[PDB]
Design an enzyme around this catalytic site. Structure first.
Site, PDB file in Angstrom:
ATOM      1  N   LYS A 101       3.884   1.791  -4.659  1.00 35.82           N
ATOM      2  CA  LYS A 101       4.747   1.087  -5.608  1.00 35.82           C
ATOM      3  C   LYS A 101       4.238   1.127  -7.057  1.00 35.82           C
ATOM      4  CE  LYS A 101       5.898  -2.624  -3.629  1.00 35.82           C
ATOM      5  NZ  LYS A 101       4.529  -2.287  -3.160  1.00 35.82           N
ATOM      6  N   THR A 102       3.003   0.667  -7.247  1.00 34.40           N
ATOM      7  CA  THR A 102       2.367   0.618  -8.566  1.00 34.40           C
ATOM      8  C   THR A 102       2.032   2.006  -9.136  1.00 34.40           C
ATOM      9  OG1 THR A 102       1.311  -1.459  -7.806  1.00 34.40           O
ATOM     10  CG2 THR A 102       0.634  -0.587  -9.948  1.00 34.40           C
ATOM     11  N   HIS A 127       3.597  -7.386   0.066  1.00 32.14           N
ATOM     12  CA  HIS A 127       3.311  -8.591   0.850  1.00 32.14           C
ATOM     13  C   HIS A 127       4.492  -9.517   1.014  1.00 32.14           C
ATOM     14  CE1 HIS A 127      -0.619  -7.362  -0.729  1.00 32.14           C
ATOM     15  NE2 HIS A 127      -1.107  -7.870   0.388  1.00 32.14           N
ATOM     16  N   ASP A 138       0.777  -1.239   0.000  1.00 33.51           N
ATOM     17  CA  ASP A 138       0.000   0.000   0.000  1.00 33.51           C
ATOM     18  C   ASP A 138       0.809   1.290   0.000  1.00 33.51           C
ATOM     19  OD1 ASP A 138      -2.347  -1.651   0.129  1.00 33.51           O
ATOM     20  OD2 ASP A 138      -3.364  -0.116   1.348  1.00 33.51           O
TER      21      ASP A 138
HETATM   22  N1  LIG Z   1      -2.525   9.553   0.361  1.00 37.23           N
HETATM   23  C1  LIG Z   1      -1.934   8.856  -0.641  1.00 37.23           C
HETATM   24  N2  LIG Z   1      -2.470   7.684  -0.980  1.00 37.23           N
HETATM   25  C2  LIG Z   1      -1.781   7.125  -2.063  1.00 37.23           C
HETATM   26  C3  LIG Z   1      -0.625   7.552  -2.703  1.00 37.23           C
HETATM   27  N3  LIG Z   1      -0.246   6.738  -3.661  1.00 37.23           N
HETATM   28  C4  LIG Z   1      -1.067   5.750  -3.599  1.00 37.23           C
HETATM   29  N4  LIG Z   1      -2.040   5.884  -2.650  1.00 37.23           N
HETATM   30  C5  LIG Z   1      -3.183   4.979  -2.306  1.00 37.23           C
HETATM   31  O1  LIG Z   1      -2.818   3.611  -2.431  1.00 37.23           O
HETATM   32  C6  LIG Z   1      -3.750   2.938  -3.328  1.00 37.23           C
HETATM   33  C7  LIG Z   1      -3.108   1.772  -4.080  1.00 37.23           C
HETATM   34  O2  LIG Z   1      -1.680   1.794  -3.921  1.00 37.23           O
HETATM   35  P1  LIG Z   1      -0.677   0.919  -4.780  1.00 37.23           P
HETATM   36  O3  LIG Z   1       0.226   1.799  -5.529  1.00 37.23           O
HETATM   37  O4  LIG Z   1      -1.306  -0.137  -5.605  1.00 37.23           O
HETATM   38  O5  LIG Z   1       0.055   0.180  -3.637  1.00 37.23           O
HETATM   39  P2  LIG Z   1       1.190  -0.884  -3.779  1.00 37.23           P
HETATM   40  O6  LIG Z   1       2.460  -0.192  -3.468  1.00 37.23           O
HETATM   41  O7  LIG Z   1       1.188  -1.463  -5.197  1.00 37.23           O
HETATM   42  C8  LIG Z   1       0.900  -2.213  -2.553  1.00 37.23           C
HETATM   43  P3  LIG Z   1       1.040  -3.947  -3.263  1.00 37.23           P
HETATM   44  O8  LIG Z   1       1.856  -3.917  -4.537  1.00 37.23           O
HETATM   45  O9  LIG Z   1       1.779  -4.794  -2.340  1.00 37.23           O
HETATM   46  O10 LIG Z   1      -0.319  -4.413  -3.652  1.00 37.23           O
HETATM   47  C9  LIG Z   1      -4.321   4.087  -4.180  1.00 37.23           C
HETATM   48  O11 LIG Z   1      -5.578   3.771  -4.812  1.00 37.23           O
HETATM   49  C10 LIG Z   1      -4.425   5.221  -3.198  1.00 37.23           C
HETATM   50  O12 LIG Z   1      -5.625   5.400  -2.488  1.00 37.23           O
HETATM   51  C11 LIG Z   1      -0.128   8.822  -2.295  1.00 37.23           C
HETATM   52  O13 LIG Z   1       0.868   9.380  -2.762  1.00 37.23           O
HETATM   53  N5  LIG Z   1      -0.804   9.461  -1.188  1.00 37.23           N
HETATM   54 MG   LIG Z   2       1.885  -3.081  -6.520  1.00 38.86          MG
END
Ligand SMILES: Nc1nc2c(ncn2[C@@H]2O[C@H](COP(=O)(O)OP(=O)(O)CP(=O)(O)O)[C@@H](O)[C@H]2O)c(=O)[nH]1
Ligand SMILES: [Mg+2]
Length: 203
Positions: free
Chosen positions: A24-25, A85, A21
């Site tokens: 990353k993506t 994860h 969360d």
């Molecule tokens: N406040 C805030 N929330 C963010 C930011 N970037 C992402 N998010 C939140 O995180 C959500 C999804 O994040 P995501 O980029 O997929 O997380 P991840 O790093 O891939 C986690 P995993 O790969 O393990 O599933 C977004 O829909 C959003 O609500 C940011 O810069 N600020």
């Molecule tokens: Mg991801």
RNA sequence: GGGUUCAGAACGUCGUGAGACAGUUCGGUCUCUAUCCGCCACGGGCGCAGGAGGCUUGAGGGGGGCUCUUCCUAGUACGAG
């Protein structure tokens, strides 16, 4: 109707790791939109199709290392997007076993987490010489000097497994916002919009 | 009136027998007229400490009071996930 690859600049594989969360993506999809305008040959990807696998999508998280292509008038990159994860570590480790450099990703609100560790640890055992940090989730509560504590303890972590932690370029900003405006701002270079310029500090 | 609980008939069973068994089994009449109290309605009469045409206050009665899903706050508190 496929087109021939025109090798202009040199190619380097950079991956993106870090806990769950923590952006990353999105940060990944961002580099796509950001580096887009200022140059063609990029092909835009979004938070949606970066993670095209059902569930991965419908369910929320990232389950398979992506693989994105974006360049700069300086250097051509291939972005391998690992999953957070545990469990899937077998898929980040495979994504990591490639990438020349790892764009580490930590979150201002949470700070270095359990997976943030192991990932870094895997990087020190996979063979990813060079890491770059990117504090995301900064656009949260005015932390006059809190987000500073992150860069103080994150560096502690890097210099804790034989990494130039004190040297590591720790950019700051948010990918969502950065993305968001770009999302509704296809064409548009840097040195303009707020956060978009925070991505380039990283690029 | 489907069950039981009359008369018919049969099975098993008990009885020498007639018959018998909350054992089975098929069949087998459910009574136009409300006097009183009670209740839903609707009036006639007298009363309301002068006769009338109107509009009303409301003591006291009654009625009605329900619940689910989804979206947003927010993938935010909390949580390694
Ligand atoms: N406040 C805030 N929330 C963010 C930011 N970037 C992402 N998010 C939140 O995180 C959500 C999804 O994040 P995501 O980029 O997929 O997380 P991840 O790093 O891939 C986690 P995993 O790969 O393990 O599933 C977004 O829909 C959003 O609500 C940011 O810069 N600020
Ligand atoms: Mg991801």
């Amino acid at each position: 109707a496929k087109g021939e690859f025109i090798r202009t600049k040199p190619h380097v594989n950079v991956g993106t790791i870090g806990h769950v969360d923590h952006g990353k993506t999105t940060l990944t999809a961002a580099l796509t939109f950001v580096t887009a305008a200022e140059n063609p040959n990029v092909e835009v990807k979004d938070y949606g199709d970066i993670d095209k696998a059902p569930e991965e999508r419908a369910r929320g998280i990232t389950i398979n290392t992506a693989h994105v292509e974006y360049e700069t008038a300086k250097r051509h990159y291939s972005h391998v997007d690992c999953p957070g994860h545990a469990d899937y570590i077998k898929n980040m480790i495979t994504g990591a076993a490639q990438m020349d450099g790892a764009i580490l990703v930590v979150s201002a609100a949470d700070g270095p987490m359990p997976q943030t560790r192991e990932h870094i640890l895997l990087a020190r055992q996979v063979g990813v010489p060079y890491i770059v940090v990117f504090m995301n989730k900064v656009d949260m509560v005015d932390d006059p000097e809190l987000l500073d504590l992150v860069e103080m303890e994150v560096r502690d972590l890097l210099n804790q497994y034989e990494f130039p932690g004190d040297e590591v370029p720790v950019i700051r900003g948010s990918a969502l916002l950065a993305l968001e405006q770009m999302h509704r701002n296809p064409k548009t270079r840097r040195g303009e919009n707020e956060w978009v310029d925070k991505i380039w500090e990283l690029l």
